[PDB]
C-alpha cells in the first residue's frame, strides 16, 4: 500500500478575519500535501478552527449574536477563503463539534483518573491592552510587600497588571521532562534548526516546567469537565487534541486515527513551537500515544509596524489579492517571496513585480511564443521529439534533469522559495533558447524544417517539465498549459514522466486559439 503522510496547520482563532499570515501557513501545508500526493503518498491534510474561550464570547456578545451564530458566520468565511485558495484539505476540524468535544472530555477525565491532573488555584497577572496573563517573574518594576510580589507592570507594553486567582486543574508536566529530552535525542530533526531546539531546552525545560493550568472556572464558553461541570477545559488540551480528534480518536470509528497518527508534520509559525514541541509531546506521553515526527515552524509576514496581526489591524486580506490579481499570483507570491526561515515584509510593489515579471512575462510569454510558432510554422502540428539535434540540446536536456533533481532536494527540505527560483532559472533559459536558435531564420528554407521541428519539440518539452514541477504550487496554470499544448495523457503530468527527456514521440495538434495563461 501507499505510505501515509499526515500534515496539519494550526487551528486558527476566529476572533477576527484571517489575513495573508493565515493564508501563508495554509498554502504552505497545501503545497506539501500536493507534492506528497504527486510522490505517491496516501495524504491527509487537516486544518480548522479553535472556537472556545472568553475572547470569542466577547466578540459574539459585542456583535449581538450567540456564540455559535457568530462562529458559524466566521467559519463560513474561512471555508470560503480555503475554497477560493483551492486548498486540498481533507477535513476541517471545529472545536465546537461533538467529535472534538468528546475527545477533550475523555482525555481530561483520563488524566484526572491517572492522577496527572489535580485541583489547585491558578494565579496570574493580567494586562488589559496586552490581553495576556504574565507570571510574577515576568513583571517589570515589581512591587513587594513582606517579601512577596504584590504588583507590577507588563514587560511588553508597560501597563499596570492586575492579580487574578481562580480554582483550576493542573497537569504535572515536569514528571515527563527526562522522557521528553530522551525523545529529542532519539529524534534530532523533530525541532529545527539546532538553535531552536536549544532555545526550547534552555529557556523553558531547563529552569523547570511549571505545572500547567489546564482548566478555568471564571467563564463558561468552552468544553466542561464531566466530573466537575463548573470547570472549562483551557486552550492547552482543547486546541492540541484537534490533531487526533479529527481522525476519530475515541469515537465509534478510529480507522483514520489508526492509519494517519502520528503526524508527519505539524506546521505553524514560530510563536507556538514551544506548545507543540513541549506540551503536546508530554500530553501524548500521558495518553500512551505515539509522538509526531516533526514540528515545522516558519517565520512571520510583517508590515511596517511589526508582525501582521488580526487584533492589531495591520492586515492584508487574501480575498482582495485573489480578486484583483488572481489565485496563481497570490499562491506564487506567498511561496516565492517569503522563505520559511526568515521574517519578511509584505509590500504591494513586491507582489506586483513578482507576479507580473515571473508569471505573466516569463512563463506566460514563453507558452504563447511557443504555441504561436507551432501554429505559424507547422499549422498546429507539433513535430515529435526525436533526439538532441541542435548543438545546445545536450546541455539543455541535462539542465532539465538537473532542474528536477535540485527542485526535489529543495522540496524535501521545505525550501520552497529555492525550488521556485530553480524552476524559473529553467523557464528563463527556455525563453533564451528561442533567442539563441532564432526559429524564424530556420523557417526560411525547407532544408531546415527538421531542425525547426526539433527546436519546437524542445520548447514544448521544457514547458511540460516546468508545468509538472509547478503542480504543487499553482492550481490553474499547469492545467491550462497542458490544455493549450493538447497533452491529454494524464501520465505526462506526473513526476515519473520527467525521468527521461522527450516523452512526446508522436505528433500533437496544439490549440489554434492560444490565450493568456495568466491571470
Ligand atoms: N487565543 C487564545 N488565547 C489564550 C491562549 C493562552 C496563552 C497564550 C500563549 N501565547 C500565544 N501566542 N498563544 C496563541 N496565540 N495561541 C495558542 C495556540 C496553541 C496553543 Cl496549544 C496555545 C495557545 N486562546 C485560544 N486560541 N484558544 C482557547 C481555547 C479554549 C479556551 Cl477555554 C480558551 C482559549
Ligand atoms: N503574520 C503571520 N505570519 C505568518 N504566519 C501567521 C501570521 N499570523 C498568523 N499566522 C499563522 O496563524 C497561526 C496563528 O496565529 P494567530 O492567529 O494567533 O496570529 P494573529 O493574527 O497575530 O492573531 P491575534 O491578532 O489574535 O493575536 C500561526 O501559528 C501561523 O500559522
Curated annotation (Swiss-Prot):
GO terms for molecular function: ATP binding; methionine-tRNA ligase activity; tRNA binding. Keywords: Aminoacyl-tRNA synthetase, ATP-binding, Cytoplasm, Ligase, Nucleotide-binding, Protein biosynthesis, RNA-binding, tRNA-binding. Its EC number is 6.1.1.10. GO terms for cellular component: cytoplasm. It catalyses: tRNA(Met) + L-methionine + ATP = L-methionyl-tRNA(Met) + AMP + diphosphate. GO terms for biological process: methionyl-tRNA aminoacylation. Is required not only for elongation of protein synthesis but also for the initiation of all mRNA translation through initiator tRNA(fMet) aminoacylation. Homodimer. Belongs to the class-I aminoacyl-tRNA synthetase family. MetG type 2B subfamily. This is Methionine--tRNA ligase. It comes from Staphylococcus aureus (strain COL). The chain holds residues 2 to 520 of 657 of the full protein.
Amino acid at each position: 500500500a501507499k505510505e501515509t503522510f499526515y500534515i496539519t496547520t494550526p487551528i486558527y482563532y476566529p476572533s477576527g478575519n484571517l489575513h495573508i499570515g493565515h493564508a501563508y501557513s495554509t498554502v504552505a501545508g497545501d503545497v506539501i500535501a500536493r507534492y506528497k500526493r504527486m510522490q505517491g503518498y496516501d495524504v491527509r491534510y487537516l486544518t480548522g478552527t479553535d472556537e472556545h474561550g472568553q475572547k470569542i464570547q466577547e466578540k459574539a456578545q459585542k456583535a449581538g449574536k450567540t456564540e455559535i451564530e457568530y462562529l458559524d458566520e466566521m467559519i463560513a468565511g474561512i471555508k470560503q477563503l480555503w475554497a477560493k485558495l483551492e486548498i486540498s484539505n481533507d477535513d476541517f476540524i471545529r472545536t465546537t463539534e461533538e467529535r472534538h468535544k468528546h475527545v477533550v472530555e475523555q482525555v481530561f477525565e483520563r488524566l484526572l483518573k491517572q492522577g496527572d491532573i489535580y485541583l489547585g488555584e491558578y494565579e496570574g497577572w493580567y494586562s488589559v491592552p496586552d490581553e495576556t496573563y504574565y507570571t510574577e517573574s515576568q513583571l517589570v518594576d515589581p512591587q513587594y510587600e513582606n517579601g512577596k510580589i504584590i504588583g507590577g507592570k507588563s514587560p511588553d507594553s508597560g501597563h499596570e497588571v492586575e492579580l487574578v486567582k481562580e480554582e483550576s486543574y493542573f497537569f504535572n508536566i515536569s514528571k515527563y521532562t527526562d522522557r521528553l529530552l530522551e525523545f529529542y535525542d532519539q529524534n534530532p530533526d523533530f525541532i529545527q534548526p539546532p538553535s531552536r531546539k536549544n532555545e526550547m531546552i534552555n529557556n523553558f525545560i531547563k529552569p523547570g516546567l511549571a505545572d500547567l493550568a489546564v482548566s478555568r472556572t471564571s467563564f463558561n464558553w468552552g468544553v466542561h469537565v464531566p466530573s466537575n461541570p463548573k470547570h472549562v477545559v483551557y486552550v492547552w488540551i482543547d486546541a492540541l487534541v484537534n490533531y487526533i480528534s479529527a481522525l476519530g480518536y475515541l469515537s465509534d470509528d478510529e480507522s483514520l486515527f489508526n492509519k494517519y497518527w502520528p503526524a508527519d508534520i505539524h506546521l505553524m509559525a514560530k510563536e507556538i513551537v514551544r506548545f507543540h514541541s513541549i506540551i503536546w509531546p508530554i500530553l501524548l506521553m500521558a495518553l500512551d500515544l505515539p509522538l509526531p515526527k516533526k514540528v515545522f515552524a516558519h517565520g512571520w509576514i510583517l508590515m511596517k509596524d511589526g508582525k501582521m496581526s488580526k487584533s492589531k489591524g495591520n492586515v492584508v486580506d487574501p480575498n482582495i489579492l485573489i480578486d484583483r490579481y488572481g489565485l496563481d499570483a497570490t499562491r506564487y507570491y506567498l511561496m516565492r517571496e517569503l522563505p520559511f526561515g526568515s521574517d519578511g515584509v509584505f509590500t504591494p510593489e513586491a507582489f506586483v513585480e513578482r507576479t507580473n515579471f515571473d508569471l505573466a512575462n516569463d512563463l506566460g510569454n514563453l507558452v504563447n511564443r511557443t504555441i504561436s510558432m507551432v501554429n505559424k510554422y507547422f499549422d498546429g502540428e507539433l513535430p515529435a521529439y526525436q533526439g538532441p539535434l541542435h548543438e545546445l540540446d545536450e546541455e539543455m536536456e541535462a539542465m532539465a534533469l538537473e532542474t528536477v533533481k535540485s527542485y526535489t532536494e529543495s522540496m524535501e527540505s521545505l525550501q520552497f522559495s529555492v525550488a521556485l527560483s530553480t524552476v524559473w532559472k529553467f523557464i528563463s533559459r527556455t525563453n533564451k533558447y528561442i533567442d539563441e536558435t532564432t526559429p524564424w531564420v530556420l523557417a526560411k528554407d525547407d532544408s531546415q524544417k527538421d531542425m525547426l521541428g526539433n527546436v519546437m519539440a524542445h520548447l514544448v518539452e521544457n514547458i511540460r517539465y516546468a508545468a509538472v514541477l509547478l503542480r504543487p504550487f499553482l492550481t490553474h496554470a499547469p492545467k491550462e498549459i497542458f490544455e493549450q499544448l493538447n497533452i491529454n495523457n494524464p501520465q505526462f503530468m506526473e513526476f515519473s514522466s520527467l525521468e527521461q527527456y522527450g516523452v512526446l514521440n508522436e505528433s500533437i495538434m496544439v490549440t489554434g486559439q492560444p490565450k493568456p495563461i495568466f491571470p
